[PDB]
Design an enzyme around this catalytic site. Structure first.
Site, PDB file in Angstrom:
ATOM      1  N   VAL A 161       0.836  -1.175   0.000  1.00  0.00           N
ATOM      2  CA  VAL A 161       0.000   0.000   0.000  1.00  0.00           C
ATOM      3  C   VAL A 161       0.883   1.241   0.000  1.00  0.00           C
ATOM      4  O   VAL A 161       1.807   1.344   0.806  1.00  0.00           O
ATOM      5  CB  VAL A 161      -0.925  -0.014   1.222  1.00  0.00           C
ATOM      6  CG1 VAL A 161      -1.823   1.212   1.249  1.00  0.00           C
ATOM      7  CG2 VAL A 161      -1.787  -1.262   1.198  1.00  0.00           C
ATOM      8  N   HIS A 185       9.821  17.987 -20.404  1.00  0.00           N
ATOM      9  CA  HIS A 185       9.572  18.429 -21.771  1.00  0.00           C
ATOM     10  C   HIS A 185      10.632  19.372 -22.297  1.00  0.00           C
ATOM     11  O   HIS A 185      10.740  19.575 -23.499  1.00  0.00           O
ATOM     12  CB  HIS A 185       8.180  19.051 -21.884  1.00  0.00           C
ATOM     13  CG  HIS A 185       7.079  18.044 -21.808  1.00  0.00           C
ATOM     14  ND1 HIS A 185       6.538  17.461 -22.932  1.00  0.00           N
ATOM     15  CD2 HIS A 185       6.468  17.467 -20.750  1.00  0.00           C
ATOM     16  CE1 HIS A 185       5.627  16.579 -22.573  1.00  0.00           C
ATOM     17  NE2 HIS A 185       5.561  16.566 -21.254  1.00  0.00           N
ATOM     18  N   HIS A 216       9.713  11.194 -26.059  1.00  0.00           N
ATOM     19  CA  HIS A 216       9.776  10.501 -24.776  1.00  0.00           C
ATOM     20  C   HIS A 216       9.044   9.153 -24.857  1.00  0.00           C
ATOM     21  O   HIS A 216       9.429   8.208 -24.166  1.00  0.00           O
ATOM     22  CB  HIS A 216       9.268  11.383 -23.615  1.00  0.00           C
ATOM     23  CG  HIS A 216       7.837  11.825 -23.745  1.00  0.00           C
ATOM     24  ND1 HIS A 216       6.779  11.064 -23.302  1.00  0.00           N
ATOM     25  CD2 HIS A 216       7.291  12.951 -24.255  1.00  0.00           C
ATOM     26  CE1 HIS A 216       5.642  11.691 -23.547  1.00  0.00           C
ATOM     27  NE2 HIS A 216       5.925  12.840 -24.123  1.00  0.00           N
ATOM     28  N   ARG A 240      -7.212  21.708 -19.698  1.00  0.00           N
ATOM     29  CA  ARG A 240      -5.867  21.411 -20.131  1.00  0.00           C
ATOM     30  C   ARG A 240      -5.242  22.685 -20.722  1.00  0.00           C
ATOM     31  O   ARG A 240      -4.088  23.009 -20.479  1.00  0.00           O
ATOM     32  CB  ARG A 240      -5.906  20.289 -21.148  1.00  0.00           C
ATOM     33  CG  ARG A 240      -4.554  19.984 -21.747  1.00  0.00           C
ATOM     34  CD  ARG A 240      -4.626  18.765 -22.642  1.00  0.00           C
ATOM     35  NE  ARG A 240      -3.395  18.601 -23.411  1.00  0.00           N
ATOM     36  CZ  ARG A 240      -3.145  19.203 -24.562  1.00  0.00           C
ATOM     37  NH1 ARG A 240      -4.019  20.053 -25.121  1.00  0.00           N
ATOM     38  NH2 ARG A 240      -2.008  18.937 -25.157  1.00  0.00           N
ATOM     39  N   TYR A 268       2.197  25.601 -17.746  1.00  0.00           N
ATOM     40  CA  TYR A 268       3.161  24.851 -18.546  1.00  0.00           C
ATOM     41  C   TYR A 268       3.908  25.711 -19.570  1.00  0.00           C
ATOM     42  O   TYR A 268       5.025  25.378 -19.941  1.00  0.00           O
ATOM     43  CB  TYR A 268       2.512  23.625 -19.227  1.00  0.00           C
ATOM     44  CG  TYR A 268       1.633  22.772 -18.315  1.00  0.00           C
ATOM     45  CD1 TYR A 268       2.003  22.497 -16.986  1.00  0.00           C
ATOM     46  CD2 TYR A 268       0.435  22.237 -18.788  1.00  0.00           C
ATOM     47  CE1 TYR A 268       1.200  21.722 -16.170  1.00  0.00           C
ATOM     48  CE2 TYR A 268      -0.373  21.458 -17.975  1.00  0.00           C
ATOM     49  CZ  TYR A 268       0.005  21.212 -16.662  1.00  0.00           C
ATOM     50  OH  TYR A 268      -0.825  20.447 -15.858  1.00  0.00           O
ATOM     51  N   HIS A 313       4.173  29.085 -19.040  1.00  0.00           N
ATOM     52  CA  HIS A 313       4.480  30.336 -18.385  1.00  0.00           C
ATOM     53  C   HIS A 313       5.704  31.009 -19.037  1.00  0.00           C
ATOM     54  O   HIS A 313       6.699  30.347 -19.290  1.00  0.00           O
ATOM     55  CB  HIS A 313       4.754  30.089 -16.917  1.00  0.00           C
ATOM     56  CG  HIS A 313       4.819  31.340 -16.130  1.00  0.00           C
ATOM     57  ND1 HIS A 313       5.981  32.047 -15.959  1.00  0.00           N
ATOM     58  CD2 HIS A 313       3.847  32.064 -15.544  1.00  0.00           C
ATOM     59  CE1 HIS A 313       5.736  33.145 -15.274  1.00  0.00           C
ATOM     60  NE2 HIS A 313       4.446  33.172 -15.000  1.00  0.00           N
TER      61      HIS A 313
END
Ligand SMILES: Nc1ncnc2c1ncn2[C@H]1C[C@H](O)[C@@H](COP(=O)(O)OP(=O)(O)OP(=O)(O)O)O1
Ligand SMILES: Nc1ncnc2c1ncn2[C@H]1C[C@H](O)[C@@H](COP(=O)(O)OP(=O)(O)OP(=O)(O)O)O1
Ligand SMILES: Nc1ccn([C@H]2C[C@H](O)[C@@H](COP(=O)(O)OP(=O)(O)OP(=O)(O)O)O2)c(=O)n1
Ligand SMILES: Nc1ccn([C@H]2C[C@H](O)[C@@H](COP(=O)(O)OP(=O)(O)OP(=O)(O)O)O2)c(=O)n1
Ligand SMILES: [Mg+2]
Ligand SMILES: [Mg+2]
Ligand SMILES: [Mg+2]
Ligand SMILES: [Mg+2]
Lengths: 484, 479, 481, 480
Positions: free
Chosen positions: A5, A103, A121, A251, A259, A261
């Protein structure tokens, strides 16, 4: 041996099957603890310290939730424990291929370092997975829990990267058409609606300090498998269509706020620059002791295993004079002496900027002839131009046109819902480009000049008027009637 | 001008430009590469947070509290200068932390440099001095109305305490300013408030303490010829809860048995690497992990990165260190054997810690054993759990006021609050682990451990009857 | 009939089996939409607008979660869909018996209105459930989904109220399903899914953070044999969390459920109900008229007895209800009875229920030795005695919990307090005494404080926290203070 | 009298000035504890038990936050403690006029009961506020804390309802920005929305994506057309489009939920049938009806959600019909949803036509075999206008911005300067049809009529059209 767990702040207590624990406890997977999910975003959003490791666990967990839920509601699909484990493994392993600063690495660094190569990737994830399996004796363990490595390893890779061959017809080998819905869970090539997005929406929001609007648990409750064009596919309940448009809106919001910025991106750019300058001198040991570079470590998974955000600090703490230039750029990041943002604009009408033209854009900006008195003259090398393609995941296409729905009155009958049947308040376009310009010369006089060039260039190219155009370049904006 | 930062705990925080200048330095940015919870991230996957963002939070909360006091009580004459000095101390009290935070000063430095007395607090003061001097901050301080001589002294005193009224940075009438960032009197300070909220948010545990409420009810009152921060009387329950919460978080997270053993294994790797890792400090001089604390320029470069430098090394000199870290990646960890506590008046001294593995290995369990174990196969971890002041109740060191007389400070004793509160405020846990991980060694380790508990009259381990059924019957006290 | 999905802010999207939907869509269940979970607490914590209805759904959902989880981990227990539905129904229905303002009704009003009777909301819940079933033709629907009404209705009632001596006192299920009786209302140690819902729900609404993680507990829960019963056992490691659970419950009582002003509002509303009891008429079976205090004798009338009574009184024009209406109007103007202070008996002194009524008399008889403008009488004082405990009187509930270890998951064990921590409570029950004054002016309140503190001194109770400030001339006489 | 601290689950511990405490502790304000914020929404979202009372506190608190923040950043505005209190009071009091089940009352009930009258909760709020002040001796207390009741009461009312040319009397043009805080008539960006986004979301189980704290940090006052107005930082324009998107999402998911709305409709029906028989005592003992209580504030004070239960628990045979409708709600025997469609043509369906729509549906001649024939009275047609708060207009065109390089210079930002991914229209209508006949055969028939009517009117194809009316949808080539 037995189930573990794990306490995750997004998902609560997650159970992990012992096979998955075996996959996780390997150098290839643990590597993801040292790769920031949002790369340079942490340098702008201080809460975004999260790494790809914990995102991977989340995706693995959600993949299992969705496949379990489908099996529970529809036993006639004959979803096996074997299917469940294969979908969970694909979920856990689809981030294995990410490089330093996520990225930044495949979005910025590799394209500039290895322009001839085509790297994603995704491809990295498949190769890393193969290496992970072979290096750690996972195949026997797979057999021990009822997997068939030949067909199941193929299935897992297909889930990550799509069809492994050109078929031109059912293009997949890991599972037949009657299990096609299994390929929509981890990485949905048809419309982008998959469990990877659901984890990152929740996770990124929790860390960024933004609230997430999309409810994946709800979606799971309403999901069904139906026959669509002789394939069994996942279908959404009709009245959930609004939530799906909202999902893509969310998104896009996250890209706008976080993402992409403007400063996060310039930090990614500066780090990329430092990596380029360090690429000739950093040595990464791969298979059989061979030495690789940052840009070539992608060719050997043993070397790639050792390629993490640690590169940044290895450069920063270096004493070698060869790394002086690279080190100086990173030190400018620590002092927050960053390249300066000049402004943002967009192409108008049909104009679409091509990747082949990206390199010529700093030249164009420096060639502008603003009719203004200037203390300094700037050159192409003083400008950075960042072109950002924003879309709903499928270029110009509306991804909701590629979604199948069902109604309460006929749960097994799949249907289509068009934009006009939903709302007139939805977007008319699903792709756009933003152009950001930055100046490497940070003093007051250079920046004033940079602004004049930039706004002039916008005028010349018939781009949109920058939002602060009248304030930053009051002598330039009047010449353009379209802006007044 | 002021910068706005979005923090997931506090929302949008405004930062004064002087603070921005302090933050944008190598000495402060360093904290981005030091995990707040050290080896905890290897157990709680959400705990990726670093000391950097915790530092921002502490700085923000310190300003909130001093601002709130000034606004409610203008007669205190709190200046903008006072506010900035308190915020800076808040920002800078974590500067002294080393790789994996408490692993470094809790485990590594004691073993590597037993003669020295090092605390992250002392580190923070030295780092701060280095930060100021290296980055030309003194002129900037002057530009915003600070007086570097006095104010730097004040900031350091806030962090480490006194370097009669023992403080020089501020006089007795501003005594209450020394209770904000690091409260030496009773431990109630803004550092705890940030980490409760922050750690909880990342661990996936829900925090029970409400610092915003506490700020609303805080006042300054005269107490024994000092102006001190006082809490409203009816908030006394919330304060006992605060210490309960802190102790809960230690039990669940900070002293997690596996988190601690990972910290222990990393410490072991650092000890084996200490002779070979070189960190360049002032004037190019080379330092070791264990000596980087003597040069701040070298210390600036000492972060969690050391872990990966060792892990990725190819030098055969680092082979032993590297092997230990590789065992972490494969999750071949030293095995937990069990936990017990001293009974009655027994208190284990730091001087005895090293003799404990020896004692365990000397136990003579009357059981059939495949393997015989030696002292070096055992790790004994002694953990002191308390409410921050040894045996003392920290609430006895808190001043309160009542609604009917807001300027009159009072004391509230435990019996005036509840009989459901703790009767003791300190305890020790003893954890035993085995470095031999196979089934037969583990079975043996359990027999030694439980026998040793019986011999020492420690408490019966919780699973004692299951792990050592032949040993536990001999002890009537246990049944 | 198919499953419905409901969005709950605590639990997310919950699926409801069509039988449960049928139970929910009845006047007897919908009634709970008009009964505040925390009663007078809403008048102090403005976020606590929540009602018993949504708490009930939550309990039903969590009951199903736990029983599903046990069945998934241990198929050898042979938990049937029938068992799951019965446990979920008991979860949904254990709050059916609550009256206006929840604990105000059975904690304050009924004891004063009907001192001879012994009423609990639990008993109410069983009676309401019976009425719900019979009034709405639920028995056939139960049969349709594989329930056996005779046994299963018995089982559901036993889950709510306990056995209706013997080794096995229950008829609804045999000893091999004993663990099913620990889910909804745990009589052995109080650890049940009702608490887990209200911790999360109340916290979300009050603006307090809940520290207990029920999802974690569910992951570690197992059934083991204990003294020839199959019982739910917790992992040994989790013992600390369980002590924390009871600590949290006590914290929530201290902060919220026993808030001094929340309680005095409950008291004032009770007073208004007492003064309105002779005049409010509630129509029950066959058109018979009942009073607020007698509606508990007829479930048809009880169905119509909700928080609405408060507004019916407040908006009344009948001069009969003038006194009752005046008290409620004082609540709206916030002219509340005034809190004087709090104290506790020392050590092992205990106050008994038979004495509660004599306490205002004792306070008024105190002879402070202080200059007083006004003299107060017994009827001017309210004395509220509050028993705080960990759910089992003086007993430690963790002594009644069974655990298991990782090395032997089927072997149940016991863990004593000393094996856990020296930082835990030494006592598990205590009494708080709160005094209030019905005379609200400055001079009366000053006087009330002197009487109160004097009375504390006389009785050897603990020194009130603000004693030296409110009664500086009284506290010096007591050296112990 | 001193400040009180109140714990709100949305805002944390809020401080309340003693004057505000005095306003709160009145029958007129406490009334709001018995009016559900989302009306019939609670019957669909069980977490939505919240009432107007706590929302009102929130709005009052946020109004004070914003005006304090402006004063702290720009002392040259000369914002006084008096201004702050007046803005907070307006925030507290703008929900005073709401009736039973909030928007059900003025959205559905009053229009049907009193078609001739033009009533809004805003007007109600001003009248209730006047009554609150006068009934409770608040004017002296206002004076005690430095307010000037004449001008300040006017200011507060203007903040709530707008002007009773610089059209305002409560404050001059140099304090114009104060009128943008509580109910922003210019573009709808005000603190009322910010509270309800956060509050409704917390209770509904939906996450709110708009960050008001951020907006407050970036807000400034600038001169715009000889007025001092609140301006937003240029960067923040995206967040403002998101704010309106969020508002529209919440309407789609929650506020206009098809079942929430039909419950509101059924309750309205019950109120109409009870209106002749329920008596509410107002000023001097005069009796009023549910529909006329709006004419006397003393009676209106006693008009809350309690009406629902008074009807439900009634025994009077006169209330039998009303009571039966409410009992159908408890058994969940609700009017049945048939479907949803939209106009394709640019003319909005007019309010004057709403009543003729059930007739049109029943007049459709679907070419399908039907067991039952339905009549106009069997249909309910609900027309819902969805917009960004300003009819067809883009509210962001009515926002002023400033840039980092020139904080005192106000600017405008057009949609094309922001994104091509934004809406092209800012208003639309949804048409929902329901059937009062709930049996299988009636519902089948209702679906055929509905889809035929959509085809006849050239409305959009219902989403499940092909499934519910497979014989009807082929006739329309535009749908195929
Ligand atoms: N739209 C947003 N919503 C939430 N947080 C945001 C948003 N945009 C940025 N942030 C975060 C990132 C930072 O921690 C903080 C400040 O960011 P931002 O406002 O963009 O500052 P900046 O320095 O980039 O702008 P500028 O320098 O132009 O004033 O807020
Ligand atoms: N311990 C607590 N934690 C969180 N909220 C609380 C706590 N105690 C009370 N509250 C809530 C209830 C109210 O909304 C708000 C103010 O209550 P409280 O501090 O008890 O004021 P009070 O009026 O009862 O005390 P007094 O008048 O003695 O200051 O805080
Ligand atoms: N009080 C606690 C303790 C742990 N965890 C979390 C941290 C881990 O991510 C996860 C599992 O930790 P455990 O301590 O429960 O499991 P261990 O492996 O340490 O114990 P064992 O192996 O004895 O089961 O649960 C938690 O949320 N709350
Ligand atoms: N956009 C939405 C719609 C609904 N809900 C919540 C509110 C309800 O409590 C629960 C169920 O709502 P549905 O509308 O899904 O259920 P219905 O019965 O209205 O739909 P149908 O009967 O057509 O399945 O989910 C939500 O969170 N978000
Ligand atoms: Mg373990
Ligand atoms: Mg900036
Ligand atoms: Mg439905
Ligand atoms: Mg009070």
């Amino acid at each position: 041996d037995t189930m573990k767990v794990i306490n995750d702040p997004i998902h609560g207590h997650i159970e992990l099957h012992p096979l998955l624990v075996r996959i996780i406890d390997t150098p290839q997977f643990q590597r993801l603890r040292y790769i920031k999910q949002l790369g340079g975003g942490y340098y702008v959003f201080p809460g975004a310290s999260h790494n790809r490791f914990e995102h991977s666990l989340g995706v693995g967990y959600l993949a299992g939730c969705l496949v379990h839920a489908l099996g529970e509601k529809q036993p006639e699909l004959q979803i096996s424990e074997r299917d469940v484990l294969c979908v969970q493994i694909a979920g856990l392993c689809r981030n294995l291929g990410h490089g330093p600063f996520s990225h930044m690495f495949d979005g910025r660094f590799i394209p500039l370092a290895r322009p001839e190569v085509k790297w994603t990737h995704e491809q990295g994830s498949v190769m890393m997975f193969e290496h992970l399996i072979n290096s750690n004796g996972i195949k026997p363990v797979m057999e021990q829990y009822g997997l068939i490595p030949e067909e199941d390893i193929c299935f897992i890779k297909e889930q990550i990267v799509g069809p492994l061959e050109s078929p031109v017809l059912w293009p997949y080998k890991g599972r037949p058409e009657n299990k096609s819905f299994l390929y929509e869970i981890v990485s949905n090539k048809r419309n982008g609606i998959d469990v990877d997005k659901w984890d990152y929406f929740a996770r990124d929001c929790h860390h960024l300090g933004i609230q997430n609007n999309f409810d994946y648990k709800r979606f799971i409750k309403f999901a069904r498998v139906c026959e669509v064009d002789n394939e069994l596919r996942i279908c959404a309940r009709d009245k959930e269509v609004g939530n799906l448009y909202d999902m893509f809106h969310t998104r896009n919001s996250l890209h706008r706020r976080a993402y992409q910025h403007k400063v996060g991106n310039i930090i990614d750019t500066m780090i990329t620059d430092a990596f380029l300058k360090a690429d000739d001198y950093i040595e990464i040991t791969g298979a059989g002791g061979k030495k690789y570079r940052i840009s070539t470590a992608i060719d050997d998974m043993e070397a790639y295993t050792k390629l993490t955000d640690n590169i940044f600090l290895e450069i920063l703490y270096s004493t070698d004079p060869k790394l002086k230039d690279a080190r100086e750029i990173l030190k400018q990041i620590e002092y927050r002496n960053l390249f300066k943002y000049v402004g943002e604009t967009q192409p108008t009408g049909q104009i679409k900027i091509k990747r082949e033209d990206y390199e010529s854009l700093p030249k164009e900006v420096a060639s502008a002839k603003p009719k203004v008195l200037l203390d300094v003259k700037l050159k192409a090398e003083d400008f950075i131009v960042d072109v950002i393609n924003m879309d709903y995941g499928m270029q110009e296409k509306n991804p909701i046109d590629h979604v199948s729905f069902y109604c309460k009155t006929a749960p097994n009958r799949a249907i289509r819902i068009t934009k006009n049947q939903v709302s007139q308040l939805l977007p008319e376009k699903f792709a756009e480009q933003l152009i950001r310009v930055y100046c490497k010369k940070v003093d007051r006089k250079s920046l004033y000049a940079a602004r004049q060039y930039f706004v002039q260039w916008c005028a010349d190219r018939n781009f949109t008027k920058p939002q602060d155009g009248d304030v930053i370049a009051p002598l330039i904006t009047p010449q353009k009637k379209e802006w007044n």
